Design a binder for this molecule. Structure first.
Ligand SMILES: Nc1nc2c(ncn2[C@@H]2O[C@H](COP(=O)(O)OP(=O)(O)OP(=O)(O)O)[C@@H](O)[C@H]2O)c(=O)[nH]1
Ligand SMILES: Nc1ncnc2c1ncn2[C@@H]1O[C@H](COP(=O)(O)OP(=O)(O)CP(=O)(O)O)[C@@H](O)[C@H]1O
Ligand SMILES: Nc1nc2c(ncn2[C@@H]2O[C@H](COP(=O)(O)OP(=O)(O)O)[C@@H](O)[C@H]2O)c(=O)[nH]1
Ligand SMILES: COc1ccc2c(c1)NC(=O)CN2c1nc(Cl)nc2ccoc12
Ligand SMILES: [Ca+2]
Ligand SMILES: [Mg+2]
Ligand SMILES: [Mg+2]
Ligand SMILES: [Mg+2]
Lengths: 437, 427, 328, 54
C-alpha cells in the first residue's frame, strides 16, 4: 500500500475537500468521529482505503489531508462542522488576510509568509507514510489563494518531493458564479507557473457544473453546496481506484501512464452520467449503453467543448454499480458506429475499463438520486483546448489596456511575467492544434 | 477585518452621524449601545464597524473631527450621540472658515496629531485592519482641507491599508461660499493620489433628486442627507453582512479600479424615497434594475450615456428571486452593451442580501466606475477657472502661506484626470 | 431587440441579411468584437467556434456549421465519399476522383482507360488527355477528376452548363432546397477537339468575363430551362434532373450529420450551401462540388435572403414558402 | 474487439478493449525570485515615503 496526501487551497479547494471527505467516509463506512466499525485491524493496516486514511490507536481514521487558506472563515467552518473530530488541528492552516483575488498577492506577498509553515505540516503527514506516491491538489484558477499560493506550493513540492507525482483538481472560472473580474489573469498566471509541476490536471468548469444542476437537478439558482456535491461525485469516481481493490489506476503514476502521453497536454476531460434528481418521483433506471452513450454528449462534460472536432489520445471508463464487461463492449460497439471518435494516428483506438460493483454513494438529503449504475469517462481529447482559447481571449482583452496590472506590480510582480505566462499559453494552444488538427 | 471610520467637518459629521444612525438600526443597536435585535445576521460581521465593550455593548469604531465644537456638539446631543466613544471626539475652537488652507496648513495642522493619536489607539486594538473610510465635503475647510491632511498622514503611517472616502461635491445650487470650487479642486488633487476608492456624492444630484423626483420645492441639508445615508447603507452592505459575496475594502478596490487614478464611483439608489413619506407598493425586480441604472437615481450629476462603464457593482436587498435578479442584470448588459467597455469581460457583479433597509421591503444600490464622472470634474474645473483667471478670492489662501503656483498645479492635475477618463471612453 | 455581429464584410449574401435584419426594427448590430450577441455572421477562415455558447442569458447562433469543410473542399469531399459507407466507393453520382499530392491508385484507372480505349480525359484542380501532362501542372494540393465528355448541350448554341442549387440547413437540421436554381451556361459552343481552349468548358461566370448572347448574364433560370426540356426532350425538370439533385443533396448532408449537428450543443448552427451539378447526355446528374460560402444571382438575392431570415434566424428568434423541405 | 488484461476481484473487474492499432527551479532560485519581488515592494514603498516626506 502507498499513501496519498490531499491538499486543499483557498475557498474552492477547502469546500470541495469537505464534500469529497464527507463522501469518502460514507463510501468506506467511516463516522464523523473517525470510527470505522468495519475495520478489524485496529491502529494500523495496509488496506486500499489506508491510501487516504491513517489510523490511531483509539480506532480513529484520520484523512491524509491538509487544508490551507490565507483567511480563516472557510476553514473555521470545518473546525466546527459536522466532521470537526475527523481532522487533527495541525492539518488545518489559516492566515488573517487573504490574497484579495490577486495572484501576485497570494504567490509573493502573503504566500511567502506561510509557505514554510505549510510545508512543515505537509512534512508531518508525509513522515507517517511508509511509501508516499504523491499529492492531490484541490484549488481554483480564479482565487488569489487558489491560484497564487498553489503555484508557489507546487514549486516547492517538486523540490522536497522530486520523485512524487502530483495531480490537480482545478476549478475553471465561470462568470455565473465568479467573484472577481481579474480571474482570467490569475488563471493564466497560475497555469504557466504550475504547468511543469503537475503530472495530471482535471479541469472542472463551473459553467458546466452550473448548467448540469439547472438542467438535470431542477435547481433554478445552484449554490456552491449543490456544485460541490456533484463535483465530489466525479472526484470520487476518479479516486475510487486508489481507495478500493482493483487493477486499473492503482497508483498516481498509472494516471499519467494511461491518460497523459505528452507531459504538457495533461488535461483530461471528465464526463459523468447519470445525474438524476432526488426530487424526481418517477424515474426509469438507465442501462449501460444509455449511460455510456451519455459520456459523448457535451452536456454531461466537466468542460463544455466539442470532442468531435478534436482527437483522442486516451480514454478510460470507470463504472460504478451493476455493470459487466459484456454489456460494456456491446455499448462501445454501437457508439463507435454512430459518433465521431478520432484517435491520433500514433495511439491505439481503444478504451481502458474499470468496474466497481458498489453503486454510487449519495449523501443523505442531497440533490442527487440513487442510481443502479453510473460511469465516469476520462478522455484526453484535444477539444479541451477550447477552454484555453476562451481563457486566453479574455486575458488578451484586458492586458491590451494593461487593466488591473498595477495591482499585481504593486505586489512585487513584474509586468513581464504576464506576457511570459501568456507566451506559454500560446505555446500550449499550439501543441493542441498540432496533435488534433 | 475592522474598518476605522472618520468624519471631518460639518458635512462629514452630519452625514456621518446619520450613517451610524441608519446602520445601527439595521444591526439592531439602540442609542445606548445595547443590541436588541432578532436575527443573528446582524451580529456575524458586526466587528467590521463596531467594537465590543464592557457589558456586551457595541461602540462604533468612529472618530469625530472638526475645528469647531458647533456641529460636534449637535452630534453629541443627537439621537445616537451617546453611542460614540467620548474620547474619539477631537475638536478645535477657531474653525476653518470654509478655507482649504486653514484646514490643511495652519489651523488643521495644530489638531492633526491628536486625531492620529485616536486613530492609532483604534488601529492597535484591531485584529486585522482593512483600512479607513472618511466622510467629508470638499467645499468647506475642515473636512476638505484637514480631511485630506489626515488622509496624507494616515497613508504615511499605514501605507498598506485601504483608504476609502465618501466625498460630497459642492454645487452652486446648494452653495455656502464662492470659494467652494477652490477647495474642491485642491481636495480632488489629494484624493487622486492618496485614496483607493472615492464615492462621488454630488450635492447637485442630491438637489435635483429632491426637486425633480421627490417633489420637494425647497430641500434642506436634512433632505439631502437622507439620500446620502441610504446610499452609504447600501454600498457598505456587503461589508457588514454575510452572503456569497463576503467582501472587504481591498477586494472592492481590486475589482473596481482597473487604473489607480480612476477610482471615483457614481453611487446609485432605488427606489428613491423622501423623508417622512412612505410609499406602499414594493418594486418588482425589473423595476429595481431599471431605476438603479437610471441617471435620475445617480448621486453624481453625470449622464452615464455620455460615457462608458468600466466596472459596475450592484447590491439587491430584500426577499426576491435571485434568478430574476440574474436575468434582469443580464438583460441590462445585453440590451446596452455599448455602454460597457468590451476590454473588461464580465465587469458587472451582483450581490444579494436578505435584510432590507428600514422602511423598504426591496432596494437596489448601484456603484459605477464610469468615464462619465469626468463631467463632475469638468464642472468644477470651469467654476475654478472662472475665478482663478482673475485671481479672485485668492487672498484668503495666500494669507495662510499658499502660492498661486499650488493652485495652478491642482488645476492641472484635475484636467489630467479628466483627459485620462476621456482616454478610455474613446478606446 | 435581438443583437447580431458581422465578421465578413465580403459576403454579398449576408450583407443583404444585415439590411433585412436591421429593417425589422427588432435587430441591433454590434461591433465585430462585441461578445454579447445573439447571432454571428462569422468569418470564412478560422471562425472561433470555441467562444460560442458561453454567454449567460443569450441564445447564440452562427451562420456556419463547424466541420462542414469536409464537404466544401475538393480534397476533403473526395476523401469523404470514398471512405464513408453511406456514400461508398461505388457512388453512382460522383465522378471518379483521386487526391494527388505535389497516384499509384489513379494510374491503374488511367492505364485501364487506355486499355479500354474509352474516354481518358481527366480534369485536375487545367483539363488534359493521356496522363502525365496533368501531373507536371500540379507540381508547378490538387484533385484529378474524370471530365464528362458527353454533357447535355442546350440548343441553339451547342452549349455546356452547370446547375447551382442553394440549400439551407437550419438549427434542427432540416434540409431546405431553394425552389429557384440557376444554369451558369457557356456562351461558346462546346468543342471536344482541344481542351487547351477552355472558354467553352469552364462554365464559371469569371471565365466567361461571346458572353451574354442567349440570356442575360449567361444565367438561365428554372422557368425557361423547364420549358426547354418539355419542347426539346419531352420531359420536365422535376422528373429528369431535380429528383437526382434532391437525392444527392440529401445523401451528402445526412452522411455528415452526426459530425456537425448542433442538436445538443451549447450553441446553434445553420449554413447556406452551394451545390454545383453537371448533367450529362442521358439526363443524369453528377456532383461537381459543394460550396460553403456561395453567392447568389441578383434576381434571387431579395427572395433567398428573405427566406434565410424567415427559416434560419426568425425560427430561433421570433419577431413581434420558397423552400422544398428534403425529408429525412 | 480485443478484450485483454481482464482482471477480476470481489470489488469489481477491469479490462482493456482495442478497436484499431496505431498508424525544475531549485530552492535557491525560488528564494531569489521571492526576495526580488520583496525588494521591488520595498523600493516602491520607499519612493512613497520619500514623496510623502517632500
Ligand atoms: N465549484 C466551486 N467553485 C468555487 C467555490 N468557491 C469559490 N469558487 C470559485 O473560485 C473562484 C474564486 O476562488 P476562491 O477559492 O473563492 O478564492 P481563494 O482561493 O480563497 O483566493 P482569495 O479569496 O483571493 O484569497 C470563483 O470563480 C468561484 O466561482 C466552491 O466552493 N465550489
Ligand atoms: N468532372 C468534370 N467534368 C466536366 N466538367 C467539369 C468537371 N469538373 C468541373 N467541370 C467544369 O469546370 C467548371 C469549374 O470547375 P469547379 O466547379 O471545380 O471550379 P470552382 O470551384 O471554381 C466553381 P464554384 O466554386 O463556384 O463551385 C465547372 O463549372 C464545370 O463546368
Ligand atoms: N449633503 C450635505 N452637504 C453639506 C452639509 N453641510 C455642508 N454641506 C456642503 O459642504 C460644503 C460646506 O462644507 P462644510 O462641511 O460646512 O465645511 P467644514 O465644516 O469647514 O469642513 C458646502 O458646499 C455645502 O453644500 C450636509 O449636511 N449635507
Ligand atoms: C466588477 O466586478 C466586481 C465588482 C465589485 C466586487 C467584486 C467584483 N468582487 C468582490 O469581492 C468585491 N465586490 C463588491 N464589493 C462590495 Cl463591498 N459590494 C459589492 C456589490 C457587488 O459587488 C461588490
Ligand atoms: Ca485498519
Ligand atoms: Mg478566499
Ligand atoms: Mg459649514
Ligand atoms: Mg468552389
Amino acid at each position: 500500500m502507498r499513501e496519498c496526501i490531499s491538499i486543499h487551497v483557498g475557498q474552492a479547494g477547502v469546500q470541495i475537500g469537505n464534500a469529497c471527505w464527507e463522501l469518502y467516509c460514507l463510501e468506506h463506512g467511516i463516522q464523523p468521529d473517525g470510527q470505522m466499525p468495519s475495520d478489524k485491524t485496529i491502529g494500523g493496516g495496509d488496506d486500499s482505503f489506508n491510501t487516504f486514511f491513517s489510523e490511531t490507536g483509539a480506532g480513529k481514521h484520520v484523512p491524509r489531508a491538509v487544508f490551507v487558506d490565507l483567511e480563516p472563515t472557510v476553514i473555521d467552518e470545518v473546525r466546527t462542522g459536522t466532521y470537526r473530530q475527523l481532522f487533527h488541528p495541525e492539518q488545518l492552516i489559516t492566515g488573517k488576510e487573504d490574497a484579495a483575488n490577486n495572484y501576485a498577492r497570494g504567490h509573493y506577498t502573503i504566500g511567502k509568509e506561510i509557505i514554510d509553515l505549510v510545508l512543515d505540516r505537509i512534512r508531518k503527514l508525509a513522515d507517517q507514510c511508509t511509501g508516499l506516491q504523491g499529492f492531490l491538489v484541490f484549488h481554483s484558477f480564479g482565487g488569489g489563494t487558489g491560484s497564487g499560493f498553489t503555484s508557489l506550493l507546487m514549486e516547492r513540492l517538486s523540490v522536497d518531493y522530486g520523485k512524487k507525482s502530483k495531480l490537480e483538481f482545478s476549478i475553471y472560472p465561470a462568470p455565473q458564479v465568479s467573484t472577481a473580474v481579474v480571474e482570467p489573469y490569475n488563471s493564466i498566471l497560475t497555469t504557466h507557473t504550475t504547468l511543469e509541476h503537475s503530472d495530471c490536471a482535471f479541469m472542472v468548469d463551473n459553467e458546466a457544473i452550473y448548467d448540469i444542476c439547472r438542467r438535470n437537478l431542477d435547481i433554478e439558482r445552484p449554490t456552491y453546496t449543490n456544485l460541490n456535491r456533484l463535483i465530489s461525485q466525479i472526484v470520487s469516481s476518479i479516486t475510487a481506484s486508489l481507495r478500493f481493490d482493483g487493477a486499473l489506476n492503482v497508483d498516481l503514476t498509472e494516471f499519467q501512464t494511461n491518460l497523459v502521453p505528452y507531459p504538457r497536454i495533461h488535461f483530461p476531460l471528465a464526463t459523468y452520467a447519470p445525474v438524476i434528481s432526488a426530487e424526481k418521483a418517477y424515474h426509469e433506471q438507465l442501462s449501460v449503453a444509455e449511460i455510456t452513450n451519455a459520456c459523448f454528449e457535451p452536456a454531461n462534460q466537466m468542460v463544455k467543448c466539442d470532442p468531435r472536432h478534436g482527437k483522442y489520445m486516451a480514454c478510460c471508463l470507470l463504472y460504478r454499480g451493476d455493470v459487466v464487461p459484456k454489456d460494456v463492449n456491446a455499448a462501445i460497439a454501437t457508439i463507435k458506429t454512430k459518433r465521431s471518435i478520432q484517435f491520433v494516428d500514433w495511439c491505439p483506438t481503444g478504451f481502458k475499463v474499470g468496474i466497481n460493483y458498489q453503486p454510487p454513494t449519495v449523501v443523505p438529503g442531497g440533490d442527487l438520486a440513487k442510481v443502479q449504475r453510473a460511469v465516469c469517462m476520462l478522455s484526453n481529447t484535444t477539444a479541451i483546448a477550447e477552454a484555453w482559447a476562451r481563457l486566453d481571449h479574455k486575458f488578451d482583452l484586458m492586458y491590451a489596456k494593461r487593466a488591473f496590472v498595477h495591482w499585481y506590480v504593486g505586489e512585487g510582480m513584474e509586468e513581464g511575467e504576464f506576457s511570459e505566462a501568456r507566451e506559454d499559453m500560446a505555446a500550449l494552444e499550439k501543441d493542441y492544434e498540432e496533435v488534433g488538427v | 477585518r475592522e474598518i476605522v471610520h472618520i468624519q471631518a467637518g460639518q458635512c462629514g459629521n452630519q452625514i456621518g452621524a446619520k450613517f451610524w444612525e441608519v446602520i445601527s438600526d439595521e444591526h439592531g443597536i439602540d442609542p445606548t449601545g445595547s443590541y436588541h435585535g432578532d436575527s443573528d445576521l446582524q451580529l456575524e460581521r458586526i466587528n467590521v464597524y463596531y467594537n465590543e465593550a464592557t457589558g456586551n455593548k457595541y461602540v462604533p469604531r468612529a472618530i469625530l473631527v472638526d475645528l469647531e465644537p458647533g456641529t460636534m456638539d449637535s452630534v453629541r446631543s443627537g439621537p445616537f450621540g451617546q453611542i460614540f466613544r467620548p474620547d474619539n471626539f477631537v475638536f478645535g475652537q477657531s474653525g476653518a472658515g470654509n478655507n482649504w488652507a486653514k484646514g490643511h496648513y495652519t489651523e488643521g495642522a495644530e489638531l492633526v496629531d491628536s486625531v492620529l493619536d485616536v486613530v492609532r489607539k483604534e488601529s492597535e486594538s484591531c485584529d486585522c485592519l482593512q483600512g479607513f473610510q472618511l466622510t467629508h465635503s470638499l467645499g468647506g475647510g475642515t473636512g476638505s482641507g484637514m480631511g485630506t491632511l489626515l488622509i496624507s498622514k494616515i497613508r504615511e503611517e499605514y501605507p498598506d491599508r485601504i483608504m476609502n472616502t465618501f466625498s460630497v461635491m459642492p454645487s452652486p445650487k446648494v452653495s455656502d461660499t464662492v470659494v467652494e470650487p477652490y477647495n474642491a479642486t485642491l481636495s480632488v488633487h489629494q484624493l487622486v493620489e492618496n485614496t483607493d476608492e472615492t464615492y462621488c456624492i454630488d450635492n447637485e444630484a442630491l438637489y435635483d433628486i429632491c426637486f425633480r423626483t421627490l417633489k420637494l420645492t425647497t430641500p434642506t441639508y436634512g433632505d439631502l442627507n437622507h439620500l446620502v445615508s441610504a446610499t452609504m447603507s447600501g454600498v457598505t452592505t456587503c461589508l457588514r453582512f454575510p452572503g456569497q459575496l463576503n467582501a472587504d475594502l481591498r477586494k472592492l478596490a481590486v475589482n473596481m479600479v482597473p487604473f489607480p487614478r480612476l477610482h471615483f464611483f457614481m453611487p446609485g439608489f432605488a427606489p428613491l424615497t423622501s423623508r417622512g413619506s412612505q410609499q406602499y407598493r414594493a418594486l418588482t425586480v425589473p423595476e429595481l434594475t431599471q431605476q438603479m441604472f437610471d441617471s435620475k437615481n445617480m448621486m453624481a450629476a453625470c449622464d452615464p450615456r455620455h460615457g462608458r462603464y468600466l466596472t459596475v457593482a450592484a447590491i439587491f436587498r430584500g426577499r426576491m428571486s435571485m434568478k430574476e435578479v440574474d436575468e434582469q442584470m443580464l438583460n441590462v448588459q445585453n440590451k446596452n452593451s455599448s455602454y460597457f467597455v468590451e476590454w473588461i469581460p464580465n465587469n458587472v457583479k451582483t450581490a444579494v442580501c436578505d435584510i432590507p433597509p428600514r422602511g423598504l421591503k426591496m432596494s437596489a444600490t448601484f456603484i459605477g466606475n464610469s468615464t462619465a464622472i469626468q463631467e463632475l470634474f469638468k464642472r468644477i474645473s470651469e467654476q475654478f477657472t472662472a475665478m482663478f483667471r482673475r485671481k479672485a478670492f485668492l487672498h484668503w489662501y495666500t494669507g495662510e502661506g499658499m502660492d498661486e503656483m499650488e493652485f495652478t498645479e491642482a488645476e492641472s492635475n484635475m484636467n489630467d484626470l479628466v483627459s485620462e477618463y476621456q482616454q478610455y471612453q474613446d478606446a | 431587440m435581438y443583437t447580431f455581429v458581422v465578421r465578413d464584410e465580403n459576403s454579398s449574401v449576408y450583407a443583404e441579411v444585415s439590411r433585412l435584419l436591421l429593417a425589422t426594427g427588432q435587430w441591433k448590430r454590434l461591433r465585430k468584437d462585441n461578445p454579447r450577441f445573439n447571432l454571428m455572421l462569422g468569418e470564412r477562415n478560422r471562425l472561433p467556434f470555441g467562444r460560442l455558447g458561453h454567454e449567460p442569458g443569450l441564445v447564440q447562433l452562427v451562420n456556419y456549421y463547424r466541420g462542414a469543410d469536409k464537404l466544401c473542399r475538393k480534397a476533403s469531399l473526395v476523401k469523404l465519399i470514398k471512405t464513408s459507407p453511406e456514400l461508398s466507393e461505388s457512388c453512382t453520382w460522383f465522378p471518379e476522383s483521386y487526391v494527388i499530392y505535389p497516384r499509384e491508385v489513379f494510374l491503374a484507372a488511367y492505364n485501364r482507360r487506355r486499355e479500354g480505349r474509352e474516354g481518358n480525359v481527366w480534369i485536375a484542380k487545367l483539363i488534359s488527355s493521356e496522363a502525365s501532362e496533368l501531373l507536371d501542372f500540379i507540381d508547378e494540393v490538387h484533385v484529378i477528376q474524370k471530365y464528362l465528355e458527353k454533357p447535355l448541350l442546350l440548343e441553339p448554341g451547342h452549349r455546356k452548363f452547370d446547375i447551382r442549387s442553394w440549400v439551407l440547413v437550419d438549427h434542427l437540421y432540416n434540409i431546405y432546397l431553394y425552389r429557384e436554381g440557376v444554369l451558369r451556361t457557356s456562351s461558346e459552343p462546346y468543342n471536344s477537339a482541344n481542351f487547351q481552349d477552355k472558354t467553352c468548358h469552364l462554365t464559371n461566370h469569371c471565365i466567361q468575363k461571346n458572353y451574354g448572347r442567349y440570356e442575360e448574364g449567361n444565367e438561365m433560370f428554372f422557368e425557361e430551362f423547364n420549358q426547354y426540356l418539355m419542347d426539346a426532350l419531352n420531359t420536365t425538370l422535376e422528373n429528369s434532373i431535380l429528383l437526382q439533385i434532391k437525392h444527392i443533396i440529401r445523401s451528402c448532408l445526412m452522411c455528415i450529420e452526426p459530425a456537425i449537428s448542433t442538436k445538443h450543443l451549447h450553441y446553434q448552427s445553420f449554413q447556406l450551401f452551394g451545390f454545383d451539378f453537371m448533367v450529362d447526355e442521358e439526363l443524369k446528374v453528377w456532383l461537381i462540388e459543394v460550396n460553403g460560402a456561395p453567392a447568389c444571382a441578383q434576381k434571387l438575392y431579395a427572395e433567398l435572403c428573405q427566406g434565410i431570415v424567415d427559416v434560419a434566424i426568425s425560427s430561433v428568434f421570433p419577431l413581434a414558402s420558397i423552400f422544398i423541405k428534403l425529408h429525412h | 474487439m480485443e478484450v485483454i488484461e481482464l482482471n477480476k476481484c470481489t470489488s469489481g473487474q477491469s479490462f482493456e478493449v482495442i478497436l484499431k492499432p496505431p498508424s525544475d527551479p531549485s530552492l535557491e532560485e525560488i528564494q531569489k525570485k521571492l526576495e526580488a519581488a520583496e525588494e521591488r515592494r520595498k523600493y516602491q514603498e520607499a519612493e512613497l515615503l520619500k514623496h510623502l516626506a517632500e
